[PDB]
Design a protein around this ligand. Structure first.
Ligand SMILES: *SCCNC(=O)C(C)(C)Oc1ccccc1
Ligand SMILES: *SCCNC(=O)C(C)(C)Oc1ccccc1
Ligand SMILES: [Mg+2]
Ligand SMILES: [Mg+2]
Lengths: 5, 236, 236, 5
């Protein structure tokens, strides 16, 4: 899964 | 609200204790109580709110993905019928996740966003609005799915418009907003080219602004820039 | 009970799903519902019950330790008074932990232990009784603290007596019981020499019985023997 | 902390 903040 | 009798300052103090104890459900309950006191939140308080609910919903999302995968495999041809239990339990986790998203969206609408006039507060809350509609979109299947997706897009887009007018391209809130909106494009809106273009342009505009920063600000900005690069590497 | 309307088999199936999703509170709720159907539990079902509650209370214990440490430091001389909040929140976590322990002890007393006639079930449940009284003893300070400690000791001792008569020295339940009772001696009863003697004798008697085992049984037994050795290394 | 199972 891609990075989110 | 069960936190109605507790002082605002005590709720914030307990949210910080709950963070140290990795008790993120309690942290989120304390921060909900703090928001419901009706006063605006400081920068640090906005971070406590966002960390608490990010961790709660992040665990729900991970559990939902495990269950959805099991459910999908149970529905493949050749799989033995195991009854309604997998779907029921996935639905139970999904409903609890939707409940948390509705709670956060409710705090934003009543009344955090409408009182947020500075760019750093308003962009932060509109980013959060986009994020929690995005989590609803991840599990959505009904008549309202397109409207849920468009609610996320609209919140992200308003945040983007403000951030581009009011914040430098290295501001960590602006960067994190762009990171997450890019993920929205890739994973939710079926728009991988928009996702990649947004991540690239955000990264390059931040790079060109790093020279203005102190060492500590540089660390904050480059941390998020690395996430943008990590996604670009995953996607290209 | 909120699980009263769900089939026993469905509760077990959902407990297994909850384990895969790392949703240990749900796992424990499902297993509580299963026990409350009133039928005895199989070996696998006893493991699902124990894993679920071990993970729930293990997270509570870790949070309680973090908060208790903060509380102790706030009570050292030279520390600034921060109000009642740390004690209140430690007490909140402590009360929730005690509630979980009381729930497990209640399932054991009504009526798992009294129906458990085979050594592998009865020893397992009496071990669990010792463990949950041990977790109560970790946080106990009142008039009943000595009785809580003695309740743990008594349950562990009955389990030990049965296990020595009825199980081989490599049986993993017998080994895990001895491991945990040794920790009780060290951490709860202030009896480090008894802790070390029990761990050593258990390890050596198991070593001498390994030759009787299949490869798979050998793996199970040596796994717990390594934990006994790890504790011995910590303590000597 | 010591090992328990
Ligand atoms: S608000 C939590 C502290 N901030 C962060 O961890 C980083 C990633 C540096 O910045 C953002 C977090 C959340 C949203 C935007 C930026
Ligand atoms: S019952 C859970 C599966 N068993 C185990 O993980 C090991 C550690 C091998 O054995 C025991 C667990 C719990 C109590 C005694 C033994
Ligand atoms: Mg007040
Ligand atoms: Mg039935």
């Amino acid at each position: 899964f891609p990075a989110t903040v | 609200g069960a936190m109605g009798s507790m002082e605002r300052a005590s709720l914030i103090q307990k949210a910080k204790l709950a963070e140290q104890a990795e008790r993120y459900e309690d942290m989120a309950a304390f921060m909900k109580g703090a928001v419901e006191k009706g006063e605006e939140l400081s920068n640090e308080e906005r971070c406590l709110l966002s960390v608490a609910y990010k961790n709660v919903v992040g665990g729900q999302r991970a559990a939902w993905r495990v269950l959805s995968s099991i459910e999908q495999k149970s529905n493949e041809e050749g799989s033995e019928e195991k009854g309604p239990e997998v779907r029921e339990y996935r639905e139970k986790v999904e409903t609890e996740l939707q409940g948390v998203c509705d709670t956060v969206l409710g705090l934003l609408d009543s009344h955090l966003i409408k009182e947020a006039g500075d760019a750093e507060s308003r962009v932060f809350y509109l980013k959060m609005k986009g994020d929690y509609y995005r989590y609803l979109a991840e599990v959505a299947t009904g008549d309202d799915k397109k409207r849920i997706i468009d609610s996320a897009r609209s919140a992200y887009q308003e945040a983007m418009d403000i951030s581009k007018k009011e914040m430098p391209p290295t501001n960590p809130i602006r960067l994190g907003l762009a990171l997450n909106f890019s993920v929205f494009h890739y994973e939710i809106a079926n728009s991988p080219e928009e996702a990649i273009s947004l991540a690239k342009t955000t990264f390059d505009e931040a790079m060109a602004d790093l020279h203005t920063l102190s060492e500590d600000s540089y660390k904050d900005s480059t941390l998020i820039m690395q996430l943008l690069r990590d996604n670009l590497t995953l996607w290209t």
